[PDB]
mmCIF file of all heavy atoms in Angstrom:
data_model
loop_
_atom_site.group_PDB
_atom_site.id
_atom_site.type_symbol
_atom_site.label_atom_id
_atom_site.label_comp_id
_atom_site.label_asym_id
_atom_site.label_seq_id
_atom_site.Cartn_x
_atom_site.Cartn_y
_atom_site.Cartn_z
ATOM 1 N N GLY A 1 17.415 -2.287 1.380
ATOM 2 C CA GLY A 1 16.489 -1.742 0.424
ATOM 3 C C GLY A 1 15.920 -0.429 0.935
ATOM 4 O O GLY A 1 16.438 0.192 1.898
ATOM 5 N N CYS A 2 14.799 0.066 0.318
ATOM 6 C CA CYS A 2 14.124 1.274 0.656
ATOM 7 C C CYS A 2 12.638 1.115 0.531
ATOM 8 O O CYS A 2 12.133 0.102 0.115
ATOM 9 C CB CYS A 2 14.678 2.417 -0.202
ATOM 10 S SG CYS A 2 14.491 2.047 -1.986
ATOM 11 N N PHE A 3 11.896 2.182 0.896
ATOM 12 C CA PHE A 3 10.452 2.134 0.775
ATOM 13 C C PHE A 3 9.809 3.551 0.824
ATOM 14 O O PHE A 3 10.514 4.534 1.093
ATOM 15 C CB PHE A 3 9.824 1.314 1.928
ATOM 16 C CG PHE A 3 9.897 1.950 3.259
ATOM 17 C CD1 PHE A 3 8.756 2.351 3.893
ATOM 18 C CD2 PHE A 3 11.088 2.162 3.990
ATOM 19 C CE1 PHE A 3 8.674 3.000 5.172
ATOM 20 C CE2 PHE A 3 11.086 2.804 5.210
ATOM 21 C CZ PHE A 3 9.896 3.210 5.769
ATOM 22 N N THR A 4 8.522 3.620 0.549
ATOM 23 C CA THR A 4 7.759 4.885 0.586
ATOM 24 C C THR A 4 6.355 4.605 0.879
ATOM 25 O O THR A 4 5.799 3.560 0.488
ATOM 26 C CB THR A 4 7.840 5.638 -0.783
ATOM 27 O OG1 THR A 4 7.571 7.016 -0.533
ATOM 28 C CG2 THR A 4 6.865 5.133 -1.818
ATOM 29 N N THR A 5 5.764 5.470 1.724
ATOM 30 C CA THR A 5 4.350 5.301 2.080
ATOM 31 C C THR A 5 3.619 6.538 1.530
ATOM 32 O O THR A 5 3.928 7.671 1.811
ATOM 33 C CB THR A 5 4.175 5.205 3.601
ATOM 34 O OG1 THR A 5 4.923 6.168 4.293
ATOM 35 C CG2 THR A 5 4.633 3.802 4.090
ATOM 36 N N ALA A 6 2.601 6.247 0.675
ATOM 37 C CA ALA A 6 1.866 7.304 0.031
ATOM 38 C C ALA A 6 0.368 7.381 0.395
ATOM 39 O O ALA A 6 -0.252 6.320 0.661
ATOM 40 C CB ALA A 6 2.079 7.176 -1.489
ATOM 41 N N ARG A 7 -0.168 8.569 0.326
ATOM 42 C CA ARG A 7 -1.545 8.859 0.617
ATOM 43 C C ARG A 7 -2.377 8.648 -0.720
ATOM 44 O O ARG A 7 -1.973 9.042 -1.786
ATOM 45 C CB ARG A 7 -1.672 10.303 1.071
ATOM 46 C CG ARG A 7 -3.058 10.850 1.271
ATOM 47 C CD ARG A 7 -3.587 10.515 2.640
ATOM 48 N NE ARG A 7 -3.617 11.675 3.524
ATOM 49 C CZ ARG A 7 -4.707 12.223 4.063
ATOM 50 N NH1 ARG A 7 -5.892 11.585 3.856
ATOM 51 N NH2 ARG A 7 -4.620 13.265 4.832
ATOM 52 N N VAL A 8 -3.466 7.913 -0.594
ATOM 53 C CA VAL A 8 -4.339 7.646 -1.759
ATOM 54 C C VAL A 8 -5.668 8.379 -1.447
ATOM 55 O O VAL A 8 -6.273 8.192 -0.478
ATOM 56 C CB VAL A 8 -4.684 6.139 -1.935
ATOM 57 C CG1 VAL A 8 -5.755 5.937 -3.005
ATOM 58 C CG2 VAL A 8 -3.376 5.437 -2.450
ATOM 59 N N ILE A 9 -6.059 9.262 -2.390
ATOM 60 C CA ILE A 9 -7.284 10.078 -2.209
ATOM 61 C C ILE A 9 -8.056 9.999 -3.517
ATOM 62 O O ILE A 9 -7.562 10.277 -4.605
ATOM 63 C CB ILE A 9 -6.965 11.520 -1.883
ATOM 64 C CG1 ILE A 9 -6.000 11.608 -0.714
ATOM 65 C CG2 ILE A 9 -8.282 12.230 -1.540
ATOM 66 C CD1 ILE A 9 -5.678 13.058 -0.309
ATOM 67 N N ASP A 10 -9.334 9.560 -3.416
ATOM 68 C CA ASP A 10 -10.221 9.416 -4.563
ATOM 69 C C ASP A 10 -9.643 8.639 -5.732
ATOM 70 O O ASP A 10 -9.732 9.134 -6.846
ATOM 71 C CB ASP A 10 -10.753 10.800 -4.982
ATOM 72 C CG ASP A 10 -11.674 11.462 -3.972
ATOM 73 O OD1 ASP A 10 -12.675 10.819 -3.542
ATOM 74 O OD2 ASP A 10 -11.427 12.619 -3.653
ATOM 75 N N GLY A 11 -9.009 7.515 -5.416
ATOM 76 C CA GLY A 11 -8.455 6.693 -6.454
ATOM 77 C C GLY A 11 -7.144 7.193 -7.050
ATOM 78 O O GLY A 11 -6.653 6.601 -8.020
ATOM 79 N N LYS A 12 -6.581 8.254 -6.438
ATOM 80 C CA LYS A 12 -5.325 8.854 -6.923
ATOM 81 C C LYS A 12 -4.268 8.908 -5.841
ATOM 82 O O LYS A 12 -4.452 9.298 -4.733
ATOM 83 C CB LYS A 12 -5.584 10.327 -7.388
ATOM 84 C CG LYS A 12 -5.952 10.497 -8.823
ATOM 85 C CD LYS A 12 -7.475 10.754 -9.028
ATOM 86 C CE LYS A 12 -7.780 10.875 -10.509
ATOM 87 N NZ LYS A 12 -7.118 9.825 -11.323
ATOM 88 N N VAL A 13 -3.019 8.662 -6.263
ATOM 89 C CA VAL A 13 -1.910 8.759 -5.349
ATOM 90 C C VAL A 13 -1.442 10.164 -5.362
ATOM 91 O O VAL A 13 -1.073 10.764 -6.412
ATOM 92 C CB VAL A 13 -0.700 7.833 -5.884
ATOM 93 C CG1 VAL A 13 0.495 7.902 -4.923
ATOM 94 C CG2 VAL A 13 -1.100 6.366 -6.057
ATOM 95 N N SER A 14 -1.415 10.809 -4.158
ATOM 96 C CA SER A 14 -0.981 12.144 -4.020
ATOM 97 C C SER A 14 0.519 12.176 -4.209
ATOM 98 O O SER A 14 1.253 11.295 -3.667
ATOM 99 C CB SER A 14 -1.321 12.725 -2.617
ATOM 100 O OG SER A 14 -2.694 12.844 -2.442
ATOM 101 N N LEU A 15 1.042 13.174 -4.955
ATOM 102 C CA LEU A 15 2.491 13.409 -5.193
ATOM 103 C C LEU A 15 3.162 12.127 -5.751
ATOM 104 O O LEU A 15 4.325 11.886 -5.373
ATOM 105 C CB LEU A 15 3.193 13.851 -3.886
ATOM 106 C CG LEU A 15 2.841 15.190 -3.356
ATOM 107 C CD1 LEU A 15 3.549 15.480 -2.050
ATOM 108 C CD2 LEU A 15 3.230 16.250 -4.348
ATOM 109 N N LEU A 16 2.477 11.466 -6.621
ATOM 110 C CA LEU A 16 2.986 10.202 -7.212
ATOM 111 C C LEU A 16 4.449 10.316 -7.768
ATOM 112 O O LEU A 16 5.264 9.453 -7.564
ATOM 113 C CB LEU A 16 2.060 9.704 -8.288
ATOM 114 C CG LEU A 16 2.596 8.481 -9.127
ATOM 115 C CD1 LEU A 16 2.784 7.298 -8.199
ATOM 116 C CD2 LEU A 16 1.587 8.144 -10.219
ATOM 117 N N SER A 17 4.663 11.510 -8.481
ATOM 118 C CA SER A 17 5.975 11.702 -9.114
ATOM 119 C C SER A 17 7.022 11.901 -8.062
ATOM 120 O O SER A 17 8.185 11.443 -8.269
ATOM 121 C CB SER A 17 5.885 13.027 -9.916
ATOM 122 O OG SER A 17 7.047 13.099 -10.745
ATOM 123 N N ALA A 18 6.692 12.503 -6.900
ATOM 124 C CA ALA A 18 7.635 12.636 -5.814
ATOM 125 C C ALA A 18 8.023 11.292 -5.251
ATOM 126 O O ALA A 18 9.206 11.060 -4.931
ATOM 127 C CB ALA A 18 7.041 13.586 -4.730
ATOM 128 N N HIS A 19 7.048 10.416 -5.123
ATOM 129 C CA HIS A 19 7.356 9.107 -4.552
ATOM 130 C C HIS A 19 8.224 8.279 -5.436
ATOM 131 O O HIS A 19 9.135 7.596 -4.942
ATOM 132 C CB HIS A 19 6.017 8.371 -4.207
ATOM 133 C CG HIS A 19 5.313 8.936 -3.020
ATOM 134 N ND1 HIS A 19 5.813 8.900 -1.735
ATOM 135 C CD2 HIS A 19 4.114 9.582 -2.917
ATOM 136 C CE1 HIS A 19 4.953 9.465 -0.949
ATOM 137 N NE2 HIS A 19 3.946 9.929 -1.622
ATOM 138 N N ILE A 20 8.055 8.327 -6.741
ATOM 139 C CA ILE A 20 8.869 7.564 -7.659
ATOM 140 C C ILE A 20 10.299 8.128 -7.680
ATOM 141 O O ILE A 20 11.253 7.397 -7.779
ATOM 142 C CB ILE A 20 8.283 7.582 -9.079
ATOM 143 C CG1 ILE A 20 6.988 6.678 -9.058
ATOM 144 C CG2 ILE A 20 9.242 7.085 -10.105
ATOM 145 C CD1 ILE A 20 6.336 6.592 -10.399
ATOM 146 N N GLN A 21 10.434 9.448 -7.590
ATOM 147 C CA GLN A 21 11.739 10.085 -7.586
ATOM 148 C C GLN A 21 12.534 9.870 -6.331
ATOM 149 O O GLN A 21 13.749 9.760 -6.355
ATOM 150 C CB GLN A 21 11.555 11.585 -7.925
ATOM 151 C CG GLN A 21 11.051 11.853 -9.350
ATOM 152 C CD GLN A 21 10.585 13.201 -9.610
ATOM 153 O OE1 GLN A 21 10.659 14.098 -8.806
ATOM 154 N NE2 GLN A 21 10.065 13.440 -10.866
ATOM 155 N N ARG A 22 11.850 9.704 -5.199
ATOM 156 C CA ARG A 22 12.509 9.448 -3.924
ATOM 157 C C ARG A 22 12.955 7.956 -3.869
ATOM 158 O O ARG A 22 13.961 7.609 -3.202
ATOM 159 C CB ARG A 22 11.651 9.801 -2.700
ATOM 160 C CG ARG A 22 10.546 8.791 -2.355
ATOM 161 C CD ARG A 22 10.875 8.066 -1.036
ATOM 162 N NE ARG A 22 11.156 8.932 0.069
ATOM 163 C CZ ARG A 22 10.274 9.386 0.966
ATOM 164 N NH1 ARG A 22 9.002 8.991 0.872
ATOM 165 N NH2 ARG A 22 10.662 10.196 1.910
ATOM 166 N N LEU A 23 12.324 7.128 -4.635
ATOM 167 C CA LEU A 23 12.620 5.753 -4.752
ATOM 168 C C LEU A 23 13.877 5.503 -5.614
ATOM 169 O O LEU A 23 14.700 4.710 -5.337
ATOM 170 C CB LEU A 23 11.509 4.882 -5.300
ATOM 171 C CG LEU A 23 10.262 4.724 -4.384
ATOM 172 C CD1 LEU A 23 9.195 3.844 -5.131
ATOM 173 C CD2 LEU A 23 10.602 4.030 -3.084
ATOM 174 N N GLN A 24 13.984 6.349 -6.654
ATOM 175 C CA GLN A 24 15.145 6.265 -7.542
ATOM 176 C C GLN A 24 16.433 6.802 -6.898
ATOM 177 O O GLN A 24 17.513 6.237 -7.198
ATOM 178 C CB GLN A 24 14.872 7.082 -8.788
ATOM 179 C CG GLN A 24 13.596 6.682 -9.535
ATOM 180 C CD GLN A 24 13.247 7.573 -10.707
ATOM 181 O OE1 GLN A 24 12.971 7.074 -11.815
ATOM 182 N NE2 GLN A 24 13.193 8.837 -10.513
ATOM 183 N N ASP A 25 16.333 7.813 -6.061
ATOM 184 C CA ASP A 25 17.533 8.343 -5.394
ATOM 185 C C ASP A 25 18.032 7.390 -4.291
ATOM 186 O O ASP A 25 19.216 7.249 -4.063
ATOM 187 C CB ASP A 25 17.261 9.753 -4.826
ATOM 188 C CG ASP A 25 17.064 10.716 -5.940
ATOM 189 O OD1 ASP A 25 17.771 10.670 -6.994
ATOM 190 O OD2 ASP A 25 16.127 11.614 -5.818
ATOM 191 N N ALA A 26 17.009 6.732 -3.597
ATOM 192 C CA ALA A 26 17.354 5.813 -2.570
ATOM 193 C C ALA A 26 17.998 4.594 -3.225
ATOM 194 O O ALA A 26 18.999 4.047 -2.679
ATOM 195 C CB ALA A 26 16.055 5.380 -1.843
ATOM 196 N N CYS A 27 17.493 4.196 -4.380
ATOM 197 C CA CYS A 27 18.122 3.047 -5.106
ATOM 198 C C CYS A 27 19.506 3.486 -5.659
ATOM 199 O O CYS A 27 20.386 2.615 -5.762
ATOM 200 C CB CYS A 27 17.211 2.601 -6.241
ATOM 201 S SG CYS A 27 15.814 1.705 -5.685
ATOM 202 N N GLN A 28 19.654 4.714 -6.004
ATOM 203 C CA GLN A 28 20.927 5.217 -6.539
ATOM 204 C C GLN A 28 21.976 5.178 -5.510
ATOM 205 O O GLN A 28 23.147 4.742 -5.744
ATOM 206 C CB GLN A 28 20.729 6.635 -7.082
ATOM 207 C CG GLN A 28 22.010 7.332 -7.474
ATOM 208 C CD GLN A 28 21.802 8.652 -8.162
ATOM 209 O OE1 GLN A 28 22.412 8.963 -9.193
ATOM 210 N NE2 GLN A 28 20.899 9.483 -7.607
ATOM 211 N N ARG A 29 21.699 5.625 -4.286
ATOM 212 C CA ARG A 29 22.734 5.671 -3.262
ATOM 213 C C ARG A 29 23.032 4.301 -2.578
ATOM 214 O O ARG A 29 24.038 4.132 -2.013
ATOM 215 C CB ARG A 29 22.465 6.779 -2.150
ATOM 216 C CG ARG A 29 23.715 7.600 -1.963
ATOM 217 C CD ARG A 29 23.704 8.265 -0.564
ATOM 218 N NE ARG A 29 22.699 9.283 -0.483
ATOM 219 C CZ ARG A 29 22.237 9.772 0.650
ATOM 220 N NH1 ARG A 29 22.700 9.330 1.813
ATOM 221 N NH2 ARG A 29 21.272 10.713 0.608
ATOM 222 N N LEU A 30 22.055 3.361 -2.710
ATOM 223 C CA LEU A 30 22.252 2.047 -2.148
ATOM 224 C C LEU A 30 22.710 1.145 -3.249
ATOM 225 O O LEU A 30 22.851 -0.085 -3.038
ATOM 226 C CB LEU A 30 20.917 1.528 -1.541
ATOM 227 C CG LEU A 30 20.309 2.193 -0.303
ATOM 228 C CD1 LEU A 30 19.191 1.403 0.164
ATOM 229 C CD2 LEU A 30 21.360 2.351 0.810
ATOM 230 N N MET A 31 23.050 1.693 -4.394
ATOM 231 C CA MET A 31 23.539 0.974 -5.566
ATOM 232 C C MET A 31 22.665 -0.114 -6.164
ATOM 233 O O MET A 31 23.133 -0.984 -6.838
ATOM 234 C CB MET A 31 24.930 0.390 -5.231
ATOM 235 C CG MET A 31 26.064 1.401 -5.082
ATOM 236 S SD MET A 31 27.565 0.568 -4.483
ATOM 237 C CE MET A 31 27.274 0.746 -2.636
ATOM 238 N N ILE A 32 21.324 -0.055 -5.863
ATOM 239 C CA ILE A 32 20.395 -1.001 -6.389
ATOM 240 C C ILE A 32 19.988 -0.601 -7.768
ATOM 241 O O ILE A 32 19.350 0.415 -7.966
ATOM 242 C CB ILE A 32 19.123 -1.098 -5.473
ATOM 243 C CG1 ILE A 32 19.477 -1.506 -4.078
ATOM 244 C CG2 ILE A 32 18.110 -2.050 -6.092
ATOM 245 C CD1 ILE A 32 18.317 -1.569 -3.146
ATOM 246 N N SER A 33 20.330 -1.418 -8.763
ATOM 247 C CA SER A 33 20.031 -1.170 -10.149
ATOM 248 C C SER A 33 18.697 -1.807 -10.616
ATOM 249 O O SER A 33 18.550 -3.035 -10.480
ATOM 250 C CB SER A 33 21.118 -1.624 -11.093
ATOM 251 O OG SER A 33 20.783 -1.424 -12.419
ATOM 252 N N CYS A 34 17.792 -0.962 -11.094
ATOM 253 C CA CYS A 34 16.522 -1.379 -11.631
ATOM 254 C C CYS A 34 15.936 -0.450 -12.621
ATOM 255 O O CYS A 34 16.204 0.754 -12.590
ATOM 256 C CB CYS A 34 15.520 -1.636 -10.451
ATOM 257 S SG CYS A 34 15.485 -0.539 -9.168
ATOM 258 N N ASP A 35 15.155 -0.957 -13.567
ATOM 259 C CA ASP A 35 14.540 -0.182 -14.658
ATOM 260 C C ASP A 35 13.086 -0.351 -14.770
ATOM 261 O O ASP A 35 12.465 0.060 -15.763
ATOM 262 C CB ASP A 35 15.254 -0.506 -15.995
ATOM 263 C CG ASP A 35 15.566 -1.974 -16.138
ATOM 264 O OD1 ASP A 35 14.643 -2.840 -15.932
ATOM 265 O OD2 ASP A 35 16.686 -2.288 -16.558
ATOM 266 N N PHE A 36 12.457 -0.937 -13.777
ATOM 267 C CA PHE A 36 11.003 -1.197 -13.761
ATOM 268 C C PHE A 36 10.113 -0.019 -13.395
ATOM 269 O O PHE A 36 8.924 -0.157 -13.184
ATOM 270 C CB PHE A 36 10.683 -2.438 -12.941
ATOM 271 C CG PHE A 36 11.176 -2.369 -11.504
ATOM 272 C CD1 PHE A 36 11.013 -1.235 -10.758
ATOM 273 C CD2 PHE A 36 11.859 -3.452 -10.906
ATOM 274 C CE1 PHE A 36 11.470 -1.178 -9.403
ATOM 275 C CE2 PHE A 36 12.310 -3.417 -9.587
ATOM 276 C CZ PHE A 36 12.076 -2.260 -8.846
ATOM 277 N N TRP A 37 10.704 1.210 -13.411
ATOM 278 C CA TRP A 37 10.007 2.427 -13.057
ATOM 279 C C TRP A 37 8.670 2.598 -13.741
ATOM 280 O O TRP A 37 7.666 3.036 -13.137
ATOM 281 C CB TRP A 37 10.906 3.618 -13.136
ATOM 282 C CG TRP A 37 12.162 3.355 -12.384
ATOM 283 C CD1 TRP A 37 13.391 3.178 -12.894
ATOM 284 C CD2 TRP A 37 12.264 3.331 -10.997
ATOM 285 N NE1 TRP A 37 14.285 2.834 -11.890
ATOM 286 C CE2 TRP A 37 13.623 2.973 -10.700
ATOM 287 C CE3 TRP A 37 11.330 3.461 -9.928
ATOM 288 C CZ2 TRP A 37 14.080 2.857 -9.405
ATOM 289 C CZ3 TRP A 37 11.808 3.253 -8.631
ATOM 290 C CH2 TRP A 37 13.176 2.983 -8.360
ATOM 291 N N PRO A 38 8.633 2.433 -15.090
ATOM 292 C CA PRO A 38 7.361 2.616 -15.780
ATOM 293 C C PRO A 38 6.337 1.562 -15.297
ATOM 294 O O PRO A 38 5.120 1.917 -15.043
ATOM 295 C CB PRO A 38 7.739 2.297 -17.223
ATOM 296 C CG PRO A 38 9.230 2.728 -17.292
ATOM 297 C CD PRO A 38 9.719 2.161 -15.988
ATOM 298 N N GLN A 39 6.734 0.348 -15.170
ATOM 299 C CA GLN A 39 5.820 -0.707 -14.662
ATOM 300 C C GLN A 39 5.427 -0.519 -13.257
ATOM 301 O O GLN A 39 4.215 -0.780 -12.882
ATOM 302 C CB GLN A 39 6.531 -2.116 -14.838
ATOM 303 C CG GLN A 39 6.856 -2.493 -16.280
ATOM 304 C CD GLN A 39 8.096 -1.793 -16.802
ATOM 305 O OE1 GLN A 39 8.921 -1.352 -15.992
ATOM 306 N NE2 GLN A 39 8.318 -1.805 -18.073
ATOM 307 N N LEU A 40 6.313 -0.042 -12.394
ATOM 308 C CA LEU A 40 6.026 0.241 -10.989
ATOM 309 C C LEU A 40 5.015 1.362 -10.894
ATOM 310 O O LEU A 40 4.050 1.252 -10.102
ATOM 311 C CB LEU A 40 7.258 0.629 -10.209
ATOM 312 C CG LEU A 40 7.070 1.123 -8.746
ATOM 313 C CD1 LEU A 40 6.538 0.045 -7.887
ATOM 314 C CD2 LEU A 40 8.367 1.778 -8.211
ATOM 315 N N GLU A 41 5.087 2.407 -11.694
ATOM 316 C CA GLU A 41 4.197 3.494 -11.683
ATOM 317 C C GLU A 41 2.772 3.050 -11.943
ATOM 318 O O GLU A 41 1.852 3.417 -11.302
ATOM 319 C CB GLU A 41 4.615 4.593 -12.656
ATOM 320 C CG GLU A 41 3.566 5.719 -12.720
ATOM 321 C CD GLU A 41 3.991 6.827 -13.627
ATOM 322 O OE1 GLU A 41 5.175 6.918 -14.024
ATOM 323 O OE2 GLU A 41 3.097 7.715 -13.923
ATOM 324 N N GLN A 42 2.624 2.240 -13.026
ATOM 325 C CA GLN A 42 1.318 1.727 -13.470
ATOM 326 C C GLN A 42 0.611 0.962 -12.306
ATOM 327 O O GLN A 42 -0.540 1.118 -12.131
ATOM 328 C CB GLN A 42 1.463 0.819 -14.622
ATOM 329 C CG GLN A 42 1.965 1.459 -15.952
ATOM 330 C CD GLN A 42 2.052 0.527 -17.116
ATOM 331 O OE1 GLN A 42 1.126 0.395 -17.952
ATOM 332 N NE2 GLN A 42 3.136 -0.264 -17.169
ATOM 333 N N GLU A 43 1.427 0.105 -11.653
ATOM 334 C CA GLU A 43 0.946 -0.718 -10.566
ATOM 335 C C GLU A 43 0.496 0.092 -9.392
ATOM 336 O O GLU A 43 -0.489 -0.288 -8.700
ATOM 337 C CB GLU A 43 2.052 -1.660 -10.126
ATOM 338 C CG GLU A 43 2.364 -2.728 -11.210
ATOM 339 C CD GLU A 43 3.648 -3.463 -10.931
ATOM 340 O OE1 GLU A 43 4.366 -3.230 -9.948
ATOM 341 O OE2 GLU A 43 3.973 -4.372 -11.772
ATOM 342 N N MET A 44 1.153 1.211 -9.087
ATOM 343 C CA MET A 44 0.771 2.046 -7.941
ATOM 344 C C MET A 44 -0.566 2.717 -8.274
ATOM 345 O O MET A 44 -1.410 2.814 -7.429
ATOM 346 C CB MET A 44 1.826 3.140 -7.666
ATOM 347 C CG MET A 44 3.194 2.616 -7.237
ATOM 348 S SD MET A 44 4.368 3.886 -6.873
ATOM 349 C CE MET A 44 5.175 4.024 -8.348
ATOM 350 N N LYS A 45 -0.755 3.083 -9.517
ATOM 351 C CA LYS A 45 -1.971 3.705 -10.033
ATOM 352 C C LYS A 45 -3.154 2.810 -10.033
ATOM 353 O O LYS A 45 -4.248 3.208 -9.698
ATOM 354 C CB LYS A 45 -1.703 4.355 -11.373
ATOM 355 C CG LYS A 45 -1.090 5.752 -11.288
ATOM 356 C CD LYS A 45 -1.109 6.476 -12.582
ATOM 357 C CE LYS A 45 -0.138 5.944 -13.566
ATOM 358 N NZ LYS A 45 -0.271 6.689 -14.865
ATOM 359 N N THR A 46 -2.942 1.532 -10.402
ATOM 360 C CA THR A 46 -4.023 0.596 -10.464
ATOM 361 C C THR A 46 -4.462 0.206 -9.041
ATOM 362 O O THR A 46 -5.642 0.057 -8.764
ATOM 363 C CB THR A 46 -3.727 -0.649 -11.319
ATOM 364 O OG1 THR A 46 -2.698 -1.411 -10.655
ATOM 365 C CG2 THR A 46 -3.201 -0.224 -12.666
ATOM 366 N N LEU A 47 -3.456 0.032 -8.172
ATOM 367 C CA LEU A 47 -3.749 -0.363 -6.777
ATOM 368 C C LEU A 47 -4.463 0.792 -6.061
ATOM 369 O O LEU A 47 -5.258 0.576 -5.191
ATOM 370 C CB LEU A 47 -2.445 -0.672 -6.013
ATOM 371 C CG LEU A 47 -2.211 -2.170 -5.740
ATOM 372 C CD1 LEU A 47 -2.124 -3.007 -7.054
ATOM 373 C CD2 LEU A 47 -0.931 -2.382 -4.919
#
């Protein structure tokens, strides 16, 4: 699999879009198919 570590400042994930896009490319090259991106984004934001 793959992973990403992000900085959280004042209740906000810095470069959130970059983190989601780096997760998609890692999943693309490792052939991992998933479509939960919208749901994953929401979860990162609430956390």
